[PDB]
Amino acid sequence: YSGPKLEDGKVTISFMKELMQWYKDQKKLHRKCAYQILVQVKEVLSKLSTLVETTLKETEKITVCGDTHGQFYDLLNIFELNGLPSETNPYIFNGDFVDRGSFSVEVILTLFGFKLLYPDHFHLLRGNHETDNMNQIYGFEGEVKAKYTAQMYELFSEVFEWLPLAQCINGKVLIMHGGLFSEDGVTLDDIRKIERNRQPPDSGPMCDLLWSDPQPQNGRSISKRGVSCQFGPDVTKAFLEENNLDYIIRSHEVKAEGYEVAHGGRCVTVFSAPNYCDQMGNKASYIHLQGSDLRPQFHQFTAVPHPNVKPM
Ligand SMILES: CCCOC[C@@H]1C[C@H]2O[C@@H]1[C@H](C(=O)O)[C@@H]2C(=O)O
Numbered sequence: 378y379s380g381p382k383l384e385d386g387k388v389t390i391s392f393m394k395e396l397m398q399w400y401k402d403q404k405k406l407h408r409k410c411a412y413q414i415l416v417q418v419k420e421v422l423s424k425l426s427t428l429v430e431t432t433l434k435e436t437e438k439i440t441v442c443g444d445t446h447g448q449f450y451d452l453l454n455i456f457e458l459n460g461l462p463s464e465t466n467p468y469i470f471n472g473d474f475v476d477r478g479s480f481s482v483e484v485i486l487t488l489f490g491f492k493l494l495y496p497d498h499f500h501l502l503r504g505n506h507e508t509d510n511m512n513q514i515y516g517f518e519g520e521v522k523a524k525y526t527a528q529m530y531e532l533f534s535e536v537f538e539w540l541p542l543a544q545c546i547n548g549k550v551l552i553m554h555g556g557l558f559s560e561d562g563v564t565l566d567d568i569r570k571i572e573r574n575r576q577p578p579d580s581g582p583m584c585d586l587l588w589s590d591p592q593p594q595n596g597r598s599i600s601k602r603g604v605s606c607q608f609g610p611d612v613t614k615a616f617l618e619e620n621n622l623d624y625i626i627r628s629h630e631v632k633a634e635g636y637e638v639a640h641g642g643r644c645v646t647v648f649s650a651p652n653y654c655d656q657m658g659n660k661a662s663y664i665h666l667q668g669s670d671l672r673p674q675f676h677q678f679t680a681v682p683h684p685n686v687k688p689m
């Protein structure tokens with residue numbers, strides 16, 4: 378009976394510590410508490426712009442993480458290496474929290490819980506895996522149905538629809554899960570105006586932000602993924618200039634080193650799922666930014682042990 382409980386229906390730091398320990402021990406958060414986090418976080422997210430704009434004063438830092446894919450024990454490792462989230466220790470998790478990994482429910486409810494506890498200092502951006510098509514195929518819909526009910530998954534889907542699509546730091550660093558656009562002339566204004574509470578279209582700004590990848594050569598190509606595009610160093614350069622930006626931070630691609638600096642330093646990939654699917658053997662990384670110095674400082678980390686549940 379000693380499960381983690383909300384206090385007056387609200388998330389507290391005490392609750393989060395209890396939750397993370399509960400999840401470490403492979404136990405289930407009660408459906409009614411899961412429900413409350415989901416409805417409350419939907420309210421919080423629905424009030425946000427499609428483009429979150431964050432001001433980082435001279436002394437403040439922020440941590441940017443890439444894909445986590447239900448690798449809950451590696452998530453806790455991030456917090457042990459880099460400290461728990463707080464108003465003095467803000468985080469951005471750049472999409473793809475669920476699917477692939479076997480602890481997606483644990484990752485996402487932990488992330489939502491911290492979103493509720495620190496709404497102004499804990500940021501969640503939508504990934505391509507925070508969608509129906511992907512969830513149906515790649516594990517999350519199954520996991521929710523196994524641990525809770527079909528109805529619970531519908532609520533998760535409707536919550537994902539309210540996740541912002543991009544974040545801009547000090548008007549200079551733009552963060553999105555996928556990347557830049559299939560068409561020329563897209564601006565920050567276009568992004569702000571995206572009605573995001575939906576499943577992504579097959580093409581468009583919303584699709585691109587979740588799906589596109591950088592390529593080494595100039596111009597654009599059809600995506601190997603079958604949706605969106607591959608964009609070259611020249612595409613990046615122009616977009617940044619037209620929008621008065623310094624560089625972009627994206628995720629969406631595994632790197633053996635857990636990060637990649639491409640397009641002449643203008644396109645940065647960060648990936649936070651080490652030894653992805655227990656198979657890839659890749660390192661992962663998180664990024665430190667300061668605002669007195671918006672240049673990314675990379676921190677590589679390796680996978681930690683987890684209980685014997687196979688991917689998917
Ligand atoms: C094309 C290969 C690039 O790496 C693929 C990675 C493995 C997972 O995370 C990314 C990729 C993505 O973000 O879409 C994969 C996935 O989420 O299915």
Ligand SMILES: [Mn+2]
Nearest residue numbers: 473504505629
């Ligand atoms: Mn992705």
Ligand SMILES: [Mn+2]
Nearest residue numbers: 444473629630
């Ligand atoms: Mn991914």
